[PDB]
Nucleic acid binder design. Structure first.
Ligand SMILES: Cc1cc2nc3c(=O)[nH]c(=O)nc-3n(C[C@H](O)[C@H](O)[C@H](O)COP(=O)(O)OP(=O)(O)OC[C@H]3O[C@@H](n4cnc5c(N)ncnc54)[C@H](O)[C@@H]3O)c2cc1C
Length: 459
DNA sequence: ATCGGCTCGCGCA
DNA sequence: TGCGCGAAGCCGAT
């Protein structure tokens, strides 16, 4: 590759081969943005060294049927804006429909690709697709970490027990890896599905319409105006956070009645904005130092340790990935009698006895983003009022992935594992049902914020 | 061959 | 509200 502000350690070879005659193809998956994208940039750099065009390919899977119209519209509306952004950079974008394992392979043959580059996800499905693609192509294949500031395989070579073991290794490498971004260079070389993306959205929304979330009077639950989608909207949210919410963040990040969070998770999850970008802007901002340490810890340690978790523990969304002490503790309490037991359907409709739990579910149903403090309480009550730890993990993941705009994310699996299974936490006083897993109480919540205001806001 | 230090609830102001 | 301890398993600095 060979260039300024392009550390070679951000890229690694999935497969070696003979470089092809054709264009460099960036298989975009996790990081759906033109700016501050190390994978797009590396793909562009390979293109310059080889005197070839860079092109972006994206696969429209049947995974959308798993979630709702809320996330399909957010992603697809974002992708319509992205096609236009990429087009201004003279970068063509190709949208394939179907299975990435077969469709990426066929595209490389059909479009005569020279080099394949993709971004990094520690999720099982991306790795499965990469394995399939490797078996179907002759060309060199590179992986670039565009999501984490320090590349996941570089920060640590093993599972990290706690944030404290991770913090020294990540912080030692931050001076090297926390750096500004080069501008994306438009295409120099002339670049050689048929449906419109609007058509795809229309066909997909008709397929999802029967199962769309409705209130009892037939009126839809989802309010689409809370987070407008796309790269342009993402940046406006980051700007208002620094301007309006970062000063109060150290004091108020755990009060759900206050709108004092970044609101960046839906854009971060789809890769509509870079975490490295957000950290650069926050570092430079003159703000309360307590707020800066609190927020940088969240977007650097906690977000990037969630990738460490999924990358070194392939069963990240199961019981086995919990630490020994936690699995041992939860196992001993499997027979304990739950105070309540709710089904997925009762949980989903917000019909528990706990008005605070119900309000947290209604914030999830109506806005698509539950406040970060109540997500801890929400997941820990699923554990407390479920038949088993496995049923709890299953119900929390089902509701999180169906209804959160930021769901189906390593942060989600690491966050749920912390809450239910103690991952990256320590043991606490033993209790019935939840054992030594950290406990959170309705009364504890009453002490810390105006619980009644939150409940009133969400019926 | 031994210890300091890690993202709650509670009792106290 | 803000503070110090309790209950608690283990990592790694020494
Ligand atoms: C049960 C549970 C489920 C969760 N599910 C998800 C999910 O599906 N998707 C998701 O992106 N996050 C998830 N989180 C982490 C966190 O709640 C959200 O990222 C955060 O509330 C998003 O809102 P924000 O971006 O306004 O938060 P901010 O406070 O502004 O945080 C900014 C960023 O810091 C990172 N961050 C903050 N808290 C955490 C954390 N605990 N772990 C990892 N990264 C963190 C995120 O990237 C987040 O976007 C979950 C946490 C819990 C306890």
């Amino acid at each position: 590759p060979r260039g300024s502000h392009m550390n070679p350690k951000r890229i690694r070879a999935l497969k070696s081969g003979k470089q092809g005659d054709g264009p460099v193809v960036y298989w975009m998956s996790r990081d759906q943005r033109a700016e501050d994208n190390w994978a797009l940039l590396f793909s562009r750099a390979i293109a310059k060294e080889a005197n070839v065009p860079v092109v972006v390919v994206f696969c429209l899977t049947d995974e959308f049927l798993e979630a709702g119209i809320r996330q399909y519209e957010f992603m697809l509306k974002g992708l319509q804006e992205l096609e236009v952004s990429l087009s201004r950079k003279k970068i063509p974008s190709f949208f394939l429909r179907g299975d990435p394992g077969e469709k990426i392979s066929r595209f490389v043959k059909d479009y005569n690709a020279g080099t394949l580059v993709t971004d990094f996800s520690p999720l099982r499905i991306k790795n499965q697709w990469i394995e399939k693609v490797i078996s179907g192509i002759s060309i060199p294949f590179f992986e670039v970490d565009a999501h984490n500031v320090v590349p996941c395989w570089e920060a640590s070579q093993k599972h990290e027990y706690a944030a404290h073991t991770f913090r020294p290794k990540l912080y030692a490498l931050l001076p090297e890896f926390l750096e500004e971004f080069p501008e994306l260079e438009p295409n120099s070389v002339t670049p050689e599905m048929v449906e419109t993306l609007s058509d795809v959205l229309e066909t997909g929304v008709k397929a999802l319409l029967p199962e769309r979330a409705l209130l009892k009077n037939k009126d839809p639950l989802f309010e689409p105006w809370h987070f407008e989608p796309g790269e342009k909207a993402a940046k406006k949210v980051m700007e208002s956070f620094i301007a309006d919410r970062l000063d109060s963040y150290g004091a108020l990040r755990n009060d759900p009645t206050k709108n004092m969070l970044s609101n960046l998770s839906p854009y971060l999850h789809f890769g509509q904005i870079s975490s490295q970008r957000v950290v650069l802007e926050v570092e430079k901002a003159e703000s309360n130092p307590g707020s800066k340490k609190a927020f940088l810890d969240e977007i650097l340690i906690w977000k990037e340790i969630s990738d460490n978790f999924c990358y070194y523990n392939p069963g990240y969304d199961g019981f086995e990935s919990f630490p020994s002490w936690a699995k041992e503790s939860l196992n001993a309490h499997r027979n304990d009698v739950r105070s309540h037991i709710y089904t997925l359907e009762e949980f989903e409709a917000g019909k528990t006895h706990d008005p605070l739990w119900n309000a947290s579910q209604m914030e999830l149903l109506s806005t698509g983003k539950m406040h970060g403090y109540t997500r801890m309480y929400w997941a820990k009550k699923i554990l407390e009022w479920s038949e088993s730890p496995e049923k709890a993990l299953e119900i929390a993941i089902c509701l999180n992935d169906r209804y959160e705009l930021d769901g189906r994310d390593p942060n989600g699996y690491a966050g749920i594992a912390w809450s239910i299974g103690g991952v990256h936490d320590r043991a606490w006083g033993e209790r019935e049902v939840t054992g030594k897993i950290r406990y959170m109480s309705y009364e504890g919540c009453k002490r810390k914020f105006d619980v009644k205001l939150y409940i009133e806001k969400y019926s």
